Amino acid sequence: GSRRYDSRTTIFSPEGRLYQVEYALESISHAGTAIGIMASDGIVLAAERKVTSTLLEQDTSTEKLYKLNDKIAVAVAGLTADAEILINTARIHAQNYLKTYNEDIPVEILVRRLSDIKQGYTQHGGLRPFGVSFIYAGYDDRYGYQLYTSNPSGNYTGWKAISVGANTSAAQTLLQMDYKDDMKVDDAIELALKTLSKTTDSSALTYDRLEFATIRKGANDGEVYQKIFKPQEIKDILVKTGIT
Amino acid sequence: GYDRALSIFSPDGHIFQVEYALEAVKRGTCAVGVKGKNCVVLGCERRSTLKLQDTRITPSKVSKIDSHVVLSFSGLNADSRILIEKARVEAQSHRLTLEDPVTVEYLTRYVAGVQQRYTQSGGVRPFGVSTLIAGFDPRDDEPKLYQTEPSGIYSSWSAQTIGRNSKTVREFLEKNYDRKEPPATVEECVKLTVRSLLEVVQTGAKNIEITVVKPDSDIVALSSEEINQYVTQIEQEKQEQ
Amino acid sequence: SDPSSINGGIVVAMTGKDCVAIACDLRLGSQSLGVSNKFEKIFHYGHVFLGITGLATDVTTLNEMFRYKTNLYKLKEERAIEPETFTQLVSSSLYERRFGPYFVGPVVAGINSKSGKPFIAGFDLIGCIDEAKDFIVSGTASDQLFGMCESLYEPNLEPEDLFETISQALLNAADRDALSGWGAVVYIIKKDEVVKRYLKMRQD
Amino acid sequence: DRGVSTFSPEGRLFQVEYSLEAIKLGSTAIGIATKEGVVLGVEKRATSPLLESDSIEKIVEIDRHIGCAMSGLTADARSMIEHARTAAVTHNLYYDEDINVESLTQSVCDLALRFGEGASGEERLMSRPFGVALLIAGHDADDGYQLFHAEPSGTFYRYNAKAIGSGSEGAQAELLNEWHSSLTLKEAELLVLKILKQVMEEKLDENNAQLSCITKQDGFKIYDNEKTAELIKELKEKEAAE
Amino acid sequence: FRNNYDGDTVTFSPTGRLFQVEYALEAIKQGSVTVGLRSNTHAVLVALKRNADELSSYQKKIIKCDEHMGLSLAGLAPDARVLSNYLRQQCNYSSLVFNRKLAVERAGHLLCDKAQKNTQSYGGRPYGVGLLIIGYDKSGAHLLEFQPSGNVTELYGTAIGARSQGAKTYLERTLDTFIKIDGNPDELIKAGVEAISQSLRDESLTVDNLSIAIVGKDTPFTIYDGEAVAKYI
Amino acid sequence: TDRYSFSLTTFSPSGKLGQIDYALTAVKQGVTSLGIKATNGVVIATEKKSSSPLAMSETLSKVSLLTPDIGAVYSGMGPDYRVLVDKSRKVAHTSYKRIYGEYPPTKLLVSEVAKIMQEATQSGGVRPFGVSLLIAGHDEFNGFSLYQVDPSGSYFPWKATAIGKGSVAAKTFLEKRWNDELELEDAIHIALLTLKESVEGEFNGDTIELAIIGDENPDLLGYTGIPTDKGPRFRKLTSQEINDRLEAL
Amino acid sequence: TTTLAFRFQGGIIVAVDSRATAGNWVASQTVKKVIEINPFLLGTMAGGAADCQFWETWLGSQCRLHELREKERISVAAASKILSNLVYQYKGAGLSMGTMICGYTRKEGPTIYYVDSDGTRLKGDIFCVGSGQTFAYGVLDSNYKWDLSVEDALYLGKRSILAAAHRDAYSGGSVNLYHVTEDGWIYHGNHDVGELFWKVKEEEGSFNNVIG
Amino acid sequence: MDIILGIRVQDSVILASSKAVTRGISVLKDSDDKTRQLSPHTLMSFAGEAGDTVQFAEYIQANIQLYSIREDYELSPQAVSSFVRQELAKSIRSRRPYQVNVLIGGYDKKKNKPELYQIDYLGTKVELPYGAHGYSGFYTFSLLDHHYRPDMTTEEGLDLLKLCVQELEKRMPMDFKGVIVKIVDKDGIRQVDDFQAQ
Ligand SMILES: *[C@@](C)(CO)[C@](*)(O)[C@H](CC(C)C)NC(=O)[C@H](CCC(=O)N(C)C)NC(=O)[C@@H](NC(=O)CCCCC)C(C)C
Questions:
Q1: At D178, is the secondary structure helix, strand, or coil?
Q2: Which pairs with CB-CB distance under 8 Å and at least 24 residues apart come from G201-207?
Q3: Is G3 a catalytic residue?
Q4: I want to staple G74 with a disulfide (CB 3.0 to 4.6 A). Which of A214, F128, G66, H93 is the partner?
Q5: What atom in ligand 1 is closest to the CA of residue G20?
Q6: CATH number, residue G47
Q7: Separation between Cα atoms, residue H160 and residue H13, nearest integer Å
Q8: Euclidean distance between CA atoms F175 and D42, whole angstroms
Q9: Quick one: fold of H1-198?
């Protein structure tokens, strides 16, 4: 029968490692780098697309940054195809929560549920795992600003600053060297650019290769605001830091 | 749909997938549990590999199953969330059909039963998790400590540890824990816990997390400040000699 | 017995020169018993305003539902729902429960953000779209409202004027209905701004 | 790979045979049947001294007249015991009588071959056989005191005496020579204690070994530690005598 | 060669053989010997029981299906429990719906058809047991042989199990004798005892070792064990 | 019965998804197709590679309409494209038109198609689709758009691109010629020239398939009456309409 | 039916009649309306005969299972809820049963639960259930003190049934008595109303409304 | 029906519940607590059909308790009330629908304000200063209209309740055997034991 062709995607190695989870994590370490830094007055998300073409459209494009919610957003590293399937449940889940409790979903409860969906493909069903790592950046009336990461294993953790994708080891050490707690948002904006600029496998770090977002609570509106930087805005902020 | 037998017997008589699930536990961070005269203490280690974390929101290693019973684990974190959840649901069901919170033995037996069930159902792999379940039975002031493992086997321990280097800490407890006279104080029982983890983890302010469960649903996790004081005293014990 | 007749409440919408107006009463009762003088019947999703009369649990549900559906829409489309389009989402949503309907009488009002065109629409409990240029009425005193509007209404009213006309329509209709009234609220809508006024009416 | 329920060229089921090898790794269990009662003994075998030995439940009550001793992968036995009790109590509900030991055993063994991968016949959802053997002891009106050995193969033999687990083959040649038809219950209790002592790795005491019996009068009892301690004391006195 | 064509019953060998079925047949040859034999009045089963120890019991080889039909087993005991049960329902159904004693020839066709479905579908292993079914329906006395391939054969007399070739040559030699044993059950049972000892080698058949069953015209299907078979030793 | 309830695309030690990598190889073997986006329109074009001089090229349409405002072209395996087009049309109704009474925006119908292809990457017992698609469309709120959809399920927006055989050399040709001030007539001119580098054989309206997303076509609607209905923006050019631009090329 | 159970100084008294009817036809005068769940647990029966008998025997089974499983005897709160929850699954199918579950556990002491097919479960000290509950309540309420002796408490229970047996047409036959203590239940006899009425009337002076 | 009253004042919500359980012609109990504690600062009372009444309440109780354990956090009164409403809104269009009218008395620890919620078996939720289910409303709603001020103390709130209870004992045909009264405030849930002859 079909027994012959079954890869057995949900088994342990003699070592006690999940083959498919490991090989999927290896896949992600090749995808474009994403960075999340959380400050005292907001959170920053940035990402780099792999290299692309001039012809490529940058205005309509939003491929690594996604809005999950009024107050939650995500950076993607891995297969976009896989990522959208999950992003769509994540959106449905938040709405379900809102329909039930008449309150916006707390950031962790959202993160946990996705990570539980991921864990599923790890334990039963004989299907392949989602080749996706997420950074989550959101706000709620309980913990305030939150930054999470989740990978194909279904494991999630909380961070002050984090990276997924390619060269995360190199990027983590650089953050671990320049990050401090009393940081302003616009200080964390600079850090994320510098970090990407130092791990870039390309010649130069240009606007057409970058995506940028902030989940900053307005210093006048006094409520939470999301902002996905449009090409022109990134072009402007890149001259400020000194990368032209 | 998918029912392929993943956990099966081998020529010599082993279920390889369960043995490999144990190996996942052996890789997990160290977890310890010791019971005193009037309490149970739970100790866990936190990795140093990546150090830009957020302990406010990162799940803690010790979780409440009910107001009176806690569960710690060693192994795959993602797998643990499934076990914890089922256990919490059964805690509520139990209060609802019996009008009484769960006994530690019962709750343990149900976590053990799930684990077993994944070792002889088609299409699933065993849980890469061993658990330590601790607490006090309703209206009872006798401390309880139980250990479960991927095979679904469970039993009670005066003291036990699981995870990486649990051999090192188990050897420590086997010579330091007296069954005749258990740790009489809450304070005395915390010291014995920290001392045992200090064999494995390297001078851990952040590296050791302690949770104390007392009779009648009195569960209170210890801060980095309090634990720090124990370690400060413990390392001064050696130098006097 | 009649679910449309247990809780009470009325809604009316009306168009003018570069403006729409939507209005409701605040009553939530159970037969003769007046229970809440606060129960509002208008909601908005971006610039699209919806009013619902009928069985109040269904009113409450359908609110939550259309918030759920517009939220997901705006995230996928990256733009706010438009009155014309929303109207269509309301119809298909109701007709989905054709043989077990929501006991409601929805009303849609707003201004197309692109074309600047004023827009109102009415529905029955199974999603039949009743599109009108002048006015739409709903609830336990729809008869009284139909007569009020058909008489008081004239086209191309100015924002200030329209307010007077719609309020006097609602008030006199609610005073001939035992299950409507107890307060009232009137939304005046312009392309740029929206103005919400509570009215002073009989409390019996 | 290969089918789970697949015959070897010799004519046996691969999964069943390997399962039998898992049982040889388990703790020793001994049953002896007499006209005064049936006796069940087990080795606790604690892996560490910190393990609380009386939480090793390798003897379980199935009904007031039927008891069970296990050997092998013991977590595998929970659901076999659950089935057993439900069979017993369910039989009592329909028939207002006590289930026959013979038929209770047969019920348990019916579960044993319900493994496969969506096979022909009747809905058998289980990915592997049980890795445990059972000794089922009891009493019914018709056939008196009985001891059954329940293999994961689905077959069940009746024994006058039976040992299962690590030291079973050595213990079996021992029980062969020792058992007679006119044994008293006290002689049987001491006989279980003697054989367990011989095959164990640890020195046998009231902590690492557990006794039980089933008689017509008091039904099925698990001996408390203080009771067995006094029988261990009594045995040592008698071996020293001759 | 054989290595690649024995993973499941769904696969044919290049020669045209089904190895999984053939290994199931081997389980019968390892089983304890049992024998059948009939005349026009009565059909008889004689079976040798196998024990594990001298402390264990001799596991039973004969099963009742209905008041006119039953069988003896050789091979896997659980598979005999499944198969005998089925025939018990098929006998039961014939009675309740048609007020009919299900004939032994159709008994075999039902066993043949049930066994066959296990040899063609993925996942399902063949049955691992052979059966000797004796009956007395509306057409006299019958005896059937069942192989887990599906092949059912109506015979006067036959044996299955270990060393069963000895008993089969005996019945082949004394055909003209035992078939004419009409009206005397005893001298048919005694003819079946002399058959099974042709397949003995090591042990002498004892009082808790022997198992005998009889059906016929004025006798219903019954089981003989213990001191009740003592006369035939 | 279907015993294939497990994934057929899995991860290899290196992090490659084998079946997808291979599906993409099949796309390079397929005939060249391209797409260009002007300020007031979009053009998609491909080559009709004929199986036999006896086959009628009209009966096989490599360019297809999905909605009145959305068109699709491909490189790779034809049969896989065909069944995708059937599903793409259906999904545009079930998941959108039957809900909102209007057609899905270009980006959302792409998104739906991507999903259908992604499931072929993960579901039990299926190989991925062996096609890359080019979707060209218009919607009131986005204007004109061009998207590329890979066997993995990924999608990228393009000012211009090609897929298949000579895609490498064709993308280089487009980079030279594309600007942000192009009219739709120019975009067609470039498209014909870019396709000329791929084609060895006959180059006419008989062996070249081309369609546009331009102005509303009132005379292609089929009815007059509703003022808010102005006709489809998808237009497939005829054999004759192509030859008209090839006479002065 | 008439049945009662109440709680006092020295445990629980349980008393029931023994009559079953099909309309106005007296079907039986010797029905056992008390199920003995175990040495410490009792259940009473009122309403549909089969519904009570069947499910309360099923209850007995469910309790034995709890013992085997948890190595401990089931609490009165719990045992009542096994029945209460079963009965609620069927709510609307037309089950008809008013039940009382009385027993002793160390955790709870003396405990009585009322359970009906409406799916109502109530804890209390005094309950009367069935066609003739009101007639029992009259005599029971008017003579109840917490500090009754076991002898007096048993009598009052017996007397309360008799009152109802007399007036209620759908009650009678004979009285069955029980006493629940720390050590479990004690059966206190089967008293035929035919002989009891004339014994009580004579010895007590009551029932002066009757000729004789 | 049973009596179920609630009143919100300045710093607390007060709930009053009929003590009687009556089946047919007999009062079976005169001391029934028609309430469940959902969380340390949220209390729910209930009246309706014989069986559905407790079964619904205990079901809502399990879910909120499971939530609190899972999140180590207490839901706001607004959030709990919404959850309940939806459970009943789900119920109404099912095979055999829950027949229960509830009041939610909560103190939002985050907002430092008391909250009261009336929800009928239809899932008709409304926030109120004072609330009543069933026939009880026909007497209390007009009494409270007259005597209620939003700045009242918990003490003034209890006087106002006794006055509602006296009116029901006087005019309503049922003997409901008095009320069990509970206070929900910043310190949790406590029971006013001596309401009998206060
Ligand atoms: C009192 C005698 C008052 O009825 C008790 O409640 C008594 C209970 C004990 C446990 C028997 N109940 C009966 O005797 C019932 C009363 C039936 C009933 O609930 N009524 C409608 C009045 N009688 C029966 O259960 C009788 N069976 C039936 O009526 C069922 C047959 C109908 C199916 C076609 C039998 C005892 C004769």
A1: helix
A2: G207/G166
A3: no
A4: G66
A5: 14
A6: 3.60.20.10
A7: 13
A8: 83
A9: Glutamine Phosphoribosylpyrophosphate, subunit 1, domain 1 (3.60.20)
